[PDB]
């Protein structure tokens, strides 16, 4: 919706605007000695129709002061990235529409970078001119790169009912985004909550000066100047620190365009800012190395005057850098010095530094006990990161220890909940475990036992991603090669795999198998009773009177008798199936508990007021061959 009061242009017009701006950070007390940068671009505003605009940028030259003339004139040079800079800009064109003149919805093409988008948004906010009004006091609510705004609108010069000179001004301490954007900090610095006080010590206010065409409403020129001042470091409270943003847009020409079509990039976005990283060029890392070398040199030089300073500038650059580059570089840094790298890491509140500690630990050749200790310690930290998982996988491969694998499984579950996406890490570890087990599960009994049970820790994820591993688990369960210990571990790996129709079928096959071991048969029977079916229970009850291993028969019959004894709500449903299976069979009479396996169970149901009944279920498992004076096995 395009109100005519918002018209600041004419349709069928391309307005080519030269963008020229500079940011100059300097001290006025020393002749404004400043770090200044000069941006110059060619801009191509395109207006096939009202409020349906297309933006083509080009000829973007990025120059910055490398020196000052004696009279104070700077010396600007194009930077190394100024070419990739211009390429990045020119290689996109923007399509946008502003319903009502105060509702901005960007539609970029091919997901333009966040920072490029934000620079574009600032340019648009400079471009956006409010709808015309005859009220000089006009102040209203406006969006900007910086969020919402209470912006004042006073017409300086008006011809007829059309304003020719206008000033747009807003104090920057009132617009939505004055909240200090968080940043990584020394996680060990104890000072907190002092950020707001400083904002009081901050001064800033914006003013834009506009020259408008009364005929076609177009902006002849635009001057937007911003000045930020800081109060401390100032005698008399006026010798502080000054900053200024000065950007200008000059209308070189307004070619008329024969166009009536406007595009809308798939990605729909507003004028507001979207979070971004303190990114730095990959090169600078090498400077980090020069710096670390320098410090190592200086301790030999015996000078410590500025070492902490350089450390700070470094960790600053550090926070400018990225993750993968750091880790790739990482080994060299330790090669230089371990303890200093530690000072950096500990003072480094960035997540990657925490993740990279693991890598350090393997570098220093830590003792396995401490490796596993820290492994579990971190593994319980919420919201695991895919990277962190890759490190955990690498460490598990390297040590292949019990604690490492348990921590890996728990972190796997945590991230699985964190990210339902079956990322390539899950596939890689799944393949590695499949290698560690194969179909025969032949291997070191401790090793394969641990592999099986740790896999069970993530059973559901394995189901989701790899059915072939489940098939191999069933193979091993039905395989005679693995020891009964390994077979049982495979059975319990189904903990998180919730046996399905086929899993129940395989369990029934291996259980009703008369030659199957008594302990193995009981384990399969227990896992089958986790969620049994009436047809299954009927078959087992039919086979019960003819089962071998009298101790097995006593155990199973005692279990059934207890199930009938149980009243628990779920066991109420289970007893329906039990009854359905008891019509045409009678149980062996359950004798002996000191020399025959026996089943006992107790439930503790309490009626909590205003809450569902709480039932505590107790299972007493006794395993006795007729030759055991004491239980061969027993689980609490």
């Amino acid at each position: 919706v395009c109100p005519k009061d918002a018209t600041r242009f004419k349709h069928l017009r391309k307005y080519t605007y030269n963008y020229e701006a500079e940011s100059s950070s300097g001290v006025p007390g020393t002749a404004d000695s400043r770090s200044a940068t000069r941006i110059n671009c060619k801009v191509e505003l395109e207006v096939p129709q009202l409020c349906s605009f297309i933006l083509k940028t080009s000829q973007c030259t990025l120059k910055e002061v490398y020196g000052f003339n004696p009279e104070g004139k700077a010396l600007l040079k194009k930077t190394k990235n100024s070419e990739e800079f211009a390429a990045a800009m020119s290689r996109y064109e923007l399509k946008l529409a502003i319903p009502e003149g105060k509702q901005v919805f960007l539609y970029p093409e091919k997901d333009e970078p966040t920072y490029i988008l934000n620079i574009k948004r600032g340019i648009i906010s400079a471009l956006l001119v409010p709808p015309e009004t005859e009220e000089a006091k006009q102040v209203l609510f406006l969006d900007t790169v910086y969020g919402n705004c209470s912006t004042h609108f006073t017409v300086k010069t008006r011809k007829g009912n059309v304003a020719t000179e206008i000033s747009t001004e807003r104090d920057l301490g009132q617009c939505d985004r004055f909240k200090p954007i968080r940043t990584g900090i020394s996680p060990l610095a104890l000072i907190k909550g002092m950020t707001r006080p400083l904002s009081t010590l901050i001064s800033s206010s914006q003013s834009c000066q506009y020259t408008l065409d009364a005929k076609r409403k177009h902006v002849a020129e635009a001057i937007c100047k911003e000045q930020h001042l800081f109060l401390p470091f100032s005698y008399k409270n006026k010798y502080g620190m000054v900053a200024q943003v000065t950007q200008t847009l000059k209308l070189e020409d307004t070619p008329k365009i024969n166009s009536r079509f406007f595009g809308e990039g798939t990605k729909k976005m507003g004028l507001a800012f979207e979070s971004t990283k303190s990114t730095s060029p990959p090169k600078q890392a090498e400077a980090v190395l020069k710096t670390l070398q320098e410090l190592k040199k200086l301790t030999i030089s015996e000078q410590n005057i500025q070492r902490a300073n350089l450390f700070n500038k470094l960790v600053t650059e550090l926070r400018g850098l990225s993750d993968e580059a750091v880790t790739s570089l990482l080994p060299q840094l330790i090669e230089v010095s371990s303890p200093i790298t530690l000072q950096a890491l500990v003072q480094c509140g960035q997540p990657q530094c925490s993740t990279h500690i693991l890598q350090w630990l393997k570098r220093v050749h830590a003792n396995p006990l401490l490796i596993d200790v820290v492994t579990y310690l971190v593994a319980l930290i919420p919201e695991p990161s895919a990277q962190q998982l890759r490190e955990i996988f690498n460490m598990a491969r390297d040590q292949r220890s019990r604690a490492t694998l348990y921590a890996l499984s728990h972190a796997v579950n945590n991230y699985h909940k964190t990210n339902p996406t079956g990322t390539q890490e899950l596939l890689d570890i799944a393949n590695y475990l499949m290698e560690q087990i194969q179909d025969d599960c032949t291997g070191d009994e401790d090793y394969t036992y641990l592999i099986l049970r740790v896999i069970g820790n993530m059973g559901q994820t394995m189901e989701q991603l790899t059915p072939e591993l489940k098939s191999s688990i069933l193979k091993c369960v039905q395989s005679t090669k693995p020891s009964l210990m390994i077979q049982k571990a495979a059975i319990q790996a189904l903990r998180k795999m919730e046996p399905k129709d086929k899993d129940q079928e395989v369990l029934l096959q291996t259980f009703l198998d008369d030659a199957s071991p008594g302990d193995k048969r009981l384990a399969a029977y227990l896992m089958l009773m986790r969620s049994p079916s009436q047809a299954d229970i009927n078959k087992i009850v039919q086979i019960l009177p003819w089962e071998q291993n009298e101790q097995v028969k006593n155990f199973v019959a005692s279990h059934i008798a207890n199930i009938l004894n149980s009243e628990e709500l779920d066991i109420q449903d289970l007893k329906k199936l039990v009854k359905e299976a008891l019509k045409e069979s009678q149980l062996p009479t359950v004798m002996d508990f000191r020399k025959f396996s026996r089943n006992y169970q107790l439930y503790k149901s309490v009626s909590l007021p205003s809450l569902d009944p709480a039932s505590a279920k107790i299972e007493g498992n006794l395993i006795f061959d007729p030759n055991n004076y004491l239980p061969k096995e027993s689980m609490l």
């Binding site: 940011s23 950070s25 001290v27 007390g29 020393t30 000695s33 400043r34 770090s35 200044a36 940068t37 910055e64 930077t79 990235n81 920072y115 934000n118 620079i119 574009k120 948004r121 600032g122 790169v145 985004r177 004055f178 200090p180 968080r182 940043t183 990584g184 900090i185 020394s186 060990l188 610095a189 104890l190 914006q206 937007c224 911003e226 930020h228 800081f230 470091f233 005698y235 010798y239 620190m241 900053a243 950007q247 971004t276 990283k277 303190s278 990114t279 730095s280 600078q284 015996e302 410590n304 005057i305 070492r307 700070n312 000072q343 003072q347 604690a403 348990y406 401790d446 049970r453 998180k496």
Partner: protein, 240 residues
């Protein structure tokens, strides 16, 4: 011979397992602890025999509040400032065994510095900022050298080859570019540099000095302690 193992599950989550083989492994771990222990004394003596330098330098940020705020152009004005401590000390004694020549270093140092920084940044692209930097340093210690030779003993104390700054009150600014960190040269007008030195010894003098620009009468410039690289220092100057 019975084989047994046990494990603990919480919510069904196994919490590690214990094995008899695990007990045997722990036995070998104790044996390996003994094996590592046996050779330690000779190793630790070996470094004294050859000598080395020992450095113990913490660098801790007690105070730091960093953040950033956007800008109208869409760029990001970094803002942050910290107080930091680097309280370490240089050490490490080298012994020339059978030469009876002992070299000893012990000079703890204090680096009480502070920075504030503001920076307009272009992520992955560029930066522009200024760094407000107050400085306080100290060091003290001994450089000693003792040698026994042919029944002739001599304790040697190398003299300072540079001024010994007991105190160092320094303040500086810098203009920092993506590829560079540049100091801001001091004004020469009313550039007050002075020094007063008293004799602790004929070759060593206790020195008090101050170098600063007195621009208080000039507008836009903070008073004499500020607006420029200002140093108030307390030193022992070796005459050479």
């Amino acid at each position: 011979v019975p084989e047994a193992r046990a494990y603990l599950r919480i919510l069904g989550e196994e919490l590690g397992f214990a094995s008899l083989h695990d007990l045997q492994l722990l036995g070998k771990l104790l044996l390996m602890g003994a094996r590592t222990l046996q050779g330690i004394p000779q190793m630790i003596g070996e470094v004294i025999r050859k000598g080395s330098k020992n450095d113990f330098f913490l660098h801790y940020i007690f105070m730091e509040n960093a953040f950033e705020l956007p800008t109208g152009a869409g760029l990001q004005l970094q803002i942050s400032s910290s107080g930091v401590i680097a309280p370490g000390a240089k050490a490490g004694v080298k012994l020339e065994v059978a030469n009876m020549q002992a070299e000893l270093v012990a000079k703890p140092s204090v680096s009480v510095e502070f920075v504030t920084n503001m920076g307009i940044i272009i992520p992955d692209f560029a930066r522009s900022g200024v760094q407000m930097n107050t400085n306080f340093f100290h060091e003290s210690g001994l450089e000693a050298h003792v040698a026994l030779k042919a029944g002739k003993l001599k304790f040697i104390i190398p003299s300072p080859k540079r001024p010994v700054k007991l105190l160092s009150g320094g303040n500086t600014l810098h203009l920092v570019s993506t590829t560079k960190t540049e100091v801001i040269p001091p004004l020469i007008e009313n550039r007050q540099s002075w020094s007063v030195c008293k004799q602790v010894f004929p070759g060593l003098n206790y020195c008090t000095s101050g170098a600063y620009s007195n621009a208080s009468s000039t507008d836009s410039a903070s008073y004499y302690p500020l607006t420029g690289d200002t140093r108030l220092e307390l030193e022992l100057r070796p005459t050479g």
